[PDB]
Ligand binder design. Structure first.
Ligand SMILES: [Cl-]
Length: 156
């Protein structure tokens, strides 16, 4: 029933710097922050993939390194939720990438394991992530202006 609200002086102004016809060009801070979020997601993926061998079986998190029953592999690909980006850039999670985006990024194998688990994320991958981020943010903000129109808040 209750609702908490935290007040903090952190705001990113001028989120959209310019317009290229219909598409929106976003402030560098936002693209950088979202790319940082996704590269941290990938780093977490690699960290958990290494933890699979580093940590003993008795210390594997139930939904992180493995599925709810304890199996590390389900069907052909990896089962744990650590190897999946289900909330930040879902379009780049191994279980739901268009094959073109995977071949551009070169980010996963067939069994869902992260490529180059010890190495960091490359810069080619980062610029492709920035492209995907621009596309996603454009679609999101168009959906949101659509909703604001539909709820009668904005009115012509
Ligand atoms: Cl699970």
């Amino acid at each position: 029933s209750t609702l908490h609200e935290i007040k903090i002086d952190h705001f990113i102004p001028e989120t959209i710097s310019s317009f290229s016809n219909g598409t929106m060009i976003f402030n560098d801070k936002i693209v950088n922050a979202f790319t940082d979020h996704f590269v941290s997601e990938v780093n977490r993926m690699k960290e958990a993939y290494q933890e699979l061998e580093t940590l003993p079986e008795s210390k594997r998190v139930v939904h992180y390194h493995t599925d709810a029953r304890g199996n590390v592999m389900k069907d052909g690909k990896l089962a744990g939720n650590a190897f999946k980006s289900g909330h930040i850039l879902s379009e780049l999670s191994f279980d739901q990438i268009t094959q073109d985006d995977n071949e551009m990024l070169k980010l996963y194998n067939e069994d869902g394991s992260p490529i180059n688990p010890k190495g960091a994320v490359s810069n080619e991958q980062k610029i492709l992530i920035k492209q995907t981020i621009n596309k996603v943010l454009n679609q999101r903000i168009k959906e949101n202006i659509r909703y604001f129109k539909d709820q009668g808040l904005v009115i012509d």
